[PDB]
Design a protein around this ligand. Structure first.
Ligand SMILES: NC(=O)C1=CN([C@@H]2O[C@H](COP(=O)(O)OP(=O)(O)OC[C@H]3O[C@@H](n4cnc5c(N)ncnc54)[C@H](O)[C@@H]3O)[C@@H](O)[C@H]2O)C=CC1
Ligand SMILES: NC(=O)C1=CN([C@@H]2O[C@H](COP(=O)(O)OP(=O)(O)OC[C@H]3O[C@@H](n4cnc5c(N)ncnc54)[C@H](O)[C@@H]3O)[C@@H](O)[C@H]2O)C=CC1
Ligand SMILES: O=CNC1CCCCC1
Ligand SMILES: O=CNC1CCCCC1
Ligand SMILES: [Zn+2]
Ligand SMILES: [Zn+2]
Ligand SMILES: [Zn+2]
Ligand SMILES: [Zn+2]
Lengths: 374, 374
C-alpha cells in the first residue's frame, strides 16, 4: 500500500527549545539504499528526550525527537539484508556499523557512526527524510521515534523476536539496557559489594536491577525526591537517602554509612556536582564510579585529581556498554525468558497523542517511564 | 654497640620550604615496639621529594624527607618478627598493615595506615624519633631516608634478598615500581596496543618499560625536554613528541598519530592541564588513562564529563598499584633474575653530602635518577 511512496502521518515536532511538542502531520520519505522505514508501535519517554527540549542537550532544531522505541518494518531500501518488512525491530540510538575500530574492539560500543559526538540531525547520508509544512525536519540520534513512521539507517536498527511485547521491550532500546549494563558490564559489580545509585528514575532503577542481579549485598539509592524510594526498594535497594535531609554533604554520609566508602557508585542524574559526589563516595583505594547521567551542554566539572591518585577508577558509558545491534536481540530474548523485569519501570501508558502529558509527568516527578502507544 | 641507644648521625633537614637542605647532626631514638632502625646505604632523588621542598606536596615541616631507599637493619624493637638486624631492607612509603579493608582487598594497595591522605609527619604512634638542635623533626611518609639512620614502623619496611645491590634496588622503593606497575598492573596494557606516556623522567621511563613488557606495539613518549627522548627510545619508546614543536594541541596530535586515539595513556608529570590532555588522547570509547603524577596541593582540574560518558576509563594509583610489603621483595628477586633493568634510570651518583647538587640536577632537567650513597 505504501512501499516506495511518501507517507503522510502524524509526528511530534519540536520547533524550538522550551516549547511543548507540536502534534501535526509530517511527510516521511521512502527509504533509500540501506535504509529502513518503521511503523512505530510504542515509544518511551526518556529524560534524554526532555534534555533536547530544555537545552541540556543540543541537537539541530526543528527535530523529531524520540529514540527508545519498538515498531514493525514497513519497507526496506536497496541493499538491506538484516531486516525485512513485517519484522519487529528496535531502533538503535547508538548504531553498530560493525566495521569501525570501536565496533571491532571487544569492549567498545560507541560506534564512530553515532550522531552524538557531533550532532548533525540527519541520516547517514547527510539529508533528512522528514518534512513538515514544507520545512525539512531534523532527525534525532538516527532514530526519531516520536512519529507514526520513521526512517533509520540499517546500522541503527535491530531485528527482535517476532513474539515480543513491543509495549514493554521498547525500554530495551535505551533506559533499561543503559542502567542494567552500566552495573553488570561497565562497573562489573561484584557479588557481596556495596553500591550507591544517584538518581532513581527509569535508568537508575535499572542500575539497581543490575546491581542486584550481580549479587551486591547493599544498594543505597540516593534521590532528592523521596517519592522514588518505594519503587527503588522494590527492585533491590536496601536503603535510600535524601541529600536534603542532611546537614553534611551526602558523600560524607555515604562514606560513614559504608564504613569508609562504597565499592561501586553510579551517577544517573546528569549534574556536575553529583558526578563529583558519586566519585568521592566510593572507596578511595579501590572504588569504581560510573557516570551515566548527561550534564548540561559544554559545562566542565571541577575535581581534585587526588581522588583518582589514591586508586579510584572513574568511567562513563553510553547504552550500558552494550554493542547495540548484537545485544538488543539477546536482551529481548532474555526478557522473554523472564531474566529481568520491565513492568516496574512502567508507571504510565498513554496514547501517542498525549505526549505532552507524558513529559509533564516526567518533569513533575510523578512518572518513571511513560510508554506512548501508536 | 648502638642497640637500645640514641644514635647521633648526619641527616638532610628541611627547615623551610624552597630552601636548600641543611646537612647537620640529628639524634635518632632507638626503635619502640614494632619499629625498625635502619642504617641507610643508598637513596634515590624522586620528584616527590622535590615536591616537599617546593610546596607542591604538603607535609609538616621541619622534616627529614626521602622515601626511595635501601639499607640494613641496625636494630629492631620489641615484637618485630619480619626483619632482623643485618637484613637488607627497603622502606615502604605506602605501608602494608595487612589488616585494613584495603590490605584485604585483592586490587587495593593504598593502606589506610598511610601518612599521605592526612599528613602528620610522625611514626604510627603519633610521635617523632628525630631531634635536631634540640627540636623534634617530622618524618615523611613514614620513611625519612635522607638520614644515615632512620626508624620506621614494621608495616613500612620489607626484607629483601641478602645479595641485593642496594645502590640499584633502592629504585624499587618508589620510582621504578610506580611506573612499571602503573602500566602492567593498573592500566593492564595489552599486547599489540598503542600507549602514550606523558613525562619521561624516572617514573615515565619505568612506565615505558612496563608497556614494553606488556607487549605494546607503539609507545609514544611525550616531553617538552627533547633531551629526554634518546633514553626513552632505548627503554622501549617507538616515537617521541615534544608538544612545543606543534602548532596544535598535543591531544589532537596524538589522536591523529594513533588513527583515532591511543589504547592507554599515562600522565607522569604532575600538571592539571596534562592530566586532562592525557585523558583526551585515548580512544573515546575504550581508552584508559592513568594519572601517576602529583598535582599541586589542593588544586582542582577542570574537565568535560562527556570525555568519560563516551566510554573512557580514568584512574590513578600510588606505587603502581603494588601491595608494598608483598611486592617489593618479589620485584627485587625479579631484578636479580634480570627480568627488568634499573641501570637505564641511574644517570648520576653522588655522596649523600652532595644532596643539594643532586636536587639541582633534577631541577635543571639533566638527571633521571641520582642515587645518593651514605
Ligand atoms: N548514558 C546513556 O546512555 C544514557 C543516559 N541517560 C541520562 O541518564 C539520566 C537519567 O535518566 P532518567 O532515569 O530517564 O531520568 P529521570 O529524570 O527519570 O531520573 C532522574 C532522577 O534524578 C533525581 N534527581 C534530580 N536531581 C537530583 C539531585 N540533585 N540529587 C539527587 N537526585 C536528583 C530525580 O529526582 C529523578 O528521580 C539523564 O540525565 C539521562 O539523560 C539516559 C539514558 C541513556
Ligand atoms: N603515584 C605515585 O606513586 C608516584 C608519583 N610520582 C610523581 O610522578 C611525577 C614524575 O616523577 P619523576 O619521573 O620522578 O619526575 P621528573 O621530573 O623526573 O619527570 C618529569 C618529566 O616531565 C616533563 N615535563 C614537565 N612538564 C611537562 C609538560 N608540560 N609537558 C610534557 N612534559 C613535561 C619534564 O621535562 C620531565 O622530564 C612527579 O609528579 C612525582 O611526584 C612519583 C613517584 C610515585
Ligand atoms: O538517552 C539516550 N542517549 C543519550 C546518551 C548520552 C547523551 C545524550 C543521549
Ligand atoms: O613518590 C612517592 N610518593 C608520592 C605518591 C603520590 C603523592 C606524593 C608522594
Ligand atoms: Zn534514552
Ligand atoms: Zn562502528
Ligand atoms: Zn592496611
Ligand atoms: Zn617517589
Amino acid at each position: 500500500s505504501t512501499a516506495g511512496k511518501v507517507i503522510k502521518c502524524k509526528a511530534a515536532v519540536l520547533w524550538e527549545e522550551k516549547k511543548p511538542f507540536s502534534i501535526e502531520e509530517v511527510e516521511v520519505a521512502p527509504p533509500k539504499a540501506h535504509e529502513v522505514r518503521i511503523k512505530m508501535v510504542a515509544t518511551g519517554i526518556c529524560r534524554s528526550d526532555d534534555h533536547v527540549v530544555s537545552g541540556t542537550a543540543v541537537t539541530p532544531l526543528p527535530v523529531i525527537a524520540g529514540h527508545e522505541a519498538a515498531g514493525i518494518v514497513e519497507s526496506i531500501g536497496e541493499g538491506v539484508t538484516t531486516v525485512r518488512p513485517g519484522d519487529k525491530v528496535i531502533p538503535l540510538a547508538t548504531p553498530q556499523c560493525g566495521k569501525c575500530r570501536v565496533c571491532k574492539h571487544p569492549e567498545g560500543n560507541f560506534c564512530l557512526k553515532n550522531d552524538l559526538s557531533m550532532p548533525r540531525g540527519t541520516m547517514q547520508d547527510g539529508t533528512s527524510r522528514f518534512t513538515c509544512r514544507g520545512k525539512p525536519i531534523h532527525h534525532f540520534l538516527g532514530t526519531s521515534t516520536f512519529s507514526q513512521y520513521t526512517v533509520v539507517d540499517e546500522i541503527s536498527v535491530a531485528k527482535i523476536d517476532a513474539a515480543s511485547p513491543l509495549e514493554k521491550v521498547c525500554l530495551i532500546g535505551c533506559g533499561f539496557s543503559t542502567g542494567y549494563g552500566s552495573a553488570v558490564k561497565v562497573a562489573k559489580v561484584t557479588q557481596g559489594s556495596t553500591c550507591a545509585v544517584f538518581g532513581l528514575g527509569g535508568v537508575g532503577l535499572s542500575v539497581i536491577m543490575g546491581c542486584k542481579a550481580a549479587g551486591a549485598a547493599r544498594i543505597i539509592g540516593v534521590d532528592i525526591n523521596k517519592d522514588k524510594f518505594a519503587k527503588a526498594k522494590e527492585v533491590g535497594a536496601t536503603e535510600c537517602v535524601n541529600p536534603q535531609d542532611y546537614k553534611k554533604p551526602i558523600q560524607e554520609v555515604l562514606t560513614e554509612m559504608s564504613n569508609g566508602g562504597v565499592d561501586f557508585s553510579f551517577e544517573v542524574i546528569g549534574r556536575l556536582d553529583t558526578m563529583v559526589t558519586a566519585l568521592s563516595c566510593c572507596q578511595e583505594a579501590y572504588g569504581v564510579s560510573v557516570i551515566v547521567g548527561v550534564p548540561p551542554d559544554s559545562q566542565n566539572l571541577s575535581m581534585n585529581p587526588m581522588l583518582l591518585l589514591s586508586g579510584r577508577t572513574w568511567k562513563g558509558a553510553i547504552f550500558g556498554g552494550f554493542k547495540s545491534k548484537d545485544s538488543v536481540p539477546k536482551l529481548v530474548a532474555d526478557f522473554m525468558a523472564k531474566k529481568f523485569a520491565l513492568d516496574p519501570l512502567i508507571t504510565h501508558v498513554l496514547p501517542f497523542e498525549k505526549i505532552n502529558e507524558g513529559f509533564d509527568l516526567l518533569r513533575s516527578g510523578e512518572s518513571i517511564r511513560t510508554i506512548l502507544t501508536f
